[PDB]
Design a protein around this ligand. Structure first.
Ligand SMILES: C[As](C)(=O)[O-]
Ligand SMILES: C[As](C)(=O)[O-]
Lengths: 103, 102, 103, 102
């Protein structure tokens, strides 16, 4: 098994939010993080990012508490929903959820 | 400042009578007043919009969403169905409140 | 009310069928026919057709018995599912269900 | 003559480990033998395909669909998940049986 966290994601519902001059589209995912390594891994300086094929990143609008764990014990898994956003429809083209340290 | 509008894309449909027709796109919509005072919705209107910037008229709506005002901290929810003669409304991905209503 | 049958349709599930060399994509709709007129209307020489904006028609692969009524009494409605097909993905662009006498 | 393959598009997903990743598209699949005799599936394989003609590998599948033959009049059903490194599999709209399997 790889010495890293595996990120599994399933595309969920499509929505939108509008308030005054600000409009954005939302794409939800159910995400499971699985620590495949034999040691505990810190996720303190990490965040979930959604990405399209072209390499465009989408900001995380809301996330379940379960996915905000500071660390993952070896062999352990956590899971929850994560919702990403774009001003236009680009987030609908998000086809990958991954971990990043650019948060 | 302003009412928050949350929406989820719902069903797509159509109506045809002879050569007359239109397309429909439904959304489930929640309006939330997160402000400290009552906000009037009287001269506002719900509109669906494509990312390309086209807006679409509300054809039918649940009575809950027809409130003339929203109390501070209150929310109303219901389905709202928007229409276009052609299939452009299927491209609507946002629901917003507009102050340009005829 | 118009002196004709009103056709209401809601897009349903997307599928496919493959057998030997023959492949096709399917688009289901729930359809309601409503006779708005004050007289009975024959549907004997009529059929349901799905159509895209460009005017491309899609063949009716299967249909519920309820939609095969020979006539519609004044003020009456019938409803059921109808599934249309294309060899490629074009049927997914079907955005109108209407009546035709080209069957 | 041949086994009939019925499929319905299901969920879209992804798997990421560091810089390695792939996308998944699930379908619910029913295989039906409408022929009068048993048909061998041994040297056939399920493949998902885009209208553009690209085929996609089966990554995981329900055990029911792994039958080496199908009795006359019988059917098997289950989920089948196809994959691509890039997001091309999201374009798969057909499930078929191929006799070109490696
Ligand atoms: C937000 As990043 C690490 O995908 O550029
Ligand atoms: C099948 As026709 C009457 O839309 O050309």
């Amino acid at each position: 098994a790889p010495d890293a966290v595996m990120v599994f994601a399933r595309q969920g519902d499509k929505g939108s939010v509008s308030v005054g001059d600000k409009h954005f589209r939302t794409q939800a995912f159910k995400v499971r993080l699985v620590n495949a390594a034999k040691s505990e891994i810190s996720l303190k300086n990490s965040c979930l990012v959604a990405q399209s094929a072209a390499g465009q990143s989408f900001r995380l609008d809301t996330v379940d508490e379960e996915l905000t764990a500071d660390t993952l014990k070896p062999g352990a898994s956590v899971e929850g929903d994560a919702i990403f956003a774009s001003e236009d429809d680009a987030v609908y083209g998000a086809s990958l959820v991954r971990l990043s340290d650019r948060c």
